[PDB]
Amino acid sequence: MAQQAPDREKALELAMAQIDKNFGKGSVMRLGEEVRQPISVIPTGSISLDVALGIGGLPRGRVIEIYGPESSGKTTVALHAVANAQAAGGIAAFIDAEHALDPEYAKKLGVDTDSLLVSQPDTGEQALEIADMLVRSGALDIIVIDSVAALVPRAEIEGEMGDSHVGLQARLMSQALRKMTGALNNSGTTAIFINQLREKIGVMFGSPETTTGGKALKFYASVRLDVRRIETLKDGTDAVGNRTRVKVVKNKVSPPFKQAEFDILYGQGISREGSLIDMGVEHGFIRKSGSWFTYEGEQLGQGKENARKFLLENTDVANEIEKKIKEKLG
């Protein structure tokens, strides 16, 4: 009228709404928001991690990337990811390109191997196809491709080509990805890609940042987990496991930048127990000091691991805590 107008807020969310309607949901966010609870999500075995994913676990219907150095967790997470959506009626396909999977490990974590679909492609091209048409059938829910890096095209090798044009791999990805993101979730079949290595504070190396097939996946991924090993879980003797830190650096399904930790015991998986003590204390329900963890009056033991076994063998109480923790969160 000759007036500018609405209180920032009343005009911000007026446009901020416009945005969503034009580019989607996760398009704009206030890191603080609790924002929605879509009734879909694969638990990640770590109450720790999935209360950080903002939706109780990996969002069914989304390409999920889990990069991170070697021997730090990704797949152990992945496998668990499978175990669950599998142990809930789901069928998980696994496109192996690393040729390094130990079923009895996947077994100990609760994966039904015999009913697990494995595939060992020959070209990084074929792989994306058998996994593209394997996901179009809508039978699989969770499909995990091992190594966004070991996906070398027919013209071969990863980091070699030439003349009047150049770049291989990152294209096949670009390709597969578009063509796969579509279908991928009309079916609601969430996908997971293990990617990996070169850091713990900054990406430097040969042909540095971003990566091998990166870019595309780095843009299609609706979630990205930076899984890096932090410390070697001592066990009095040498060591029971490793503690893992996860920095969900990209979350299109809620707020990003959060993070969780948890342990992985050498052959046994992500410790549900240890994970309840941690959560259990960082939210009160479990009291400390004296190095004696105590669940409201009743004690658990003297020293993480001891209270850890207590919870291991005492499921009754354990469930309670997982519980109390559950609604104290979401």
Distance between the two ends of the chain, CA-based, in angstroms?
A: 46
CB nearer to ligand DTP: give 55 or 79. Answer: 79
Q: Which stretch binds ligand DTP (CB under 6 A): 42-50, 73-81, 83-91, 201-209?
A: 73-81
Among the residues of 47-188, which ranges form H helices?
47-50, 74-87, 103-108, 124-130, 133-136, 172-184
Q: Which stretch binds ligand DTP (CB under 6 A): 175-183, 200-208, 260-268, 271-279?
A: 260-268
- Backbone φ and ψ of 179, nearest 5°: -50, -25
* Tokens 């127990």, located at residue: 273
Q: Which of 75, 84, 169, 189 binds ligand DTP (CB under 6 A)?
A: 75
Q: Which of 56, 61, 73, 256 binds ligand DTP (CB under 6 A)?
A: 73
C-alpha–C-alpha distance, residues 136 and 188, integer Å: 10
Helices then strands (H, E): number in the chain?
A: 11, 11
C-alpha–C-alpha distance, residues 237 and 239, integer Å: 6
Q: Which stretch binds ligand DTP (CB under 6 A): 15-23, 65-73, 172-180, 306-314?
A: 65-73
Residue list 173-202, contact with ligand DTP (CB under 6 A): 196
CB nearer to ligand DTP: give 106 or 128. Answer: 106
Q: Which stretch binds ligand DTP (CB under 6 A): 69-77, 109-117, 128-136, 285-293?
A: 69-77
Residue list 263-282, contact with ligand DTP (CB under 6 A): 264, 266-267
Give, in order, the Cα–Cα distances in Å from 185 to each of 21, 143, 256.
19, 12, 21
CB nearer to ligand DTP: give 71 or 319. Answer: 71
CB nearer to ligand DTP: give 191 or 286. Answer: 191
CB nearer to ligand DTP: give 73 or 213. Answer: 73
The full DSSP string for 8-55 is HHHHHHHHHHHHHHHH-STTS--TT------S--B--S-HHHHTTSSS
Binding site for ligand DTP (CB under 6 A): 70-76, 102, 105, 196, 242, 264, 266-267
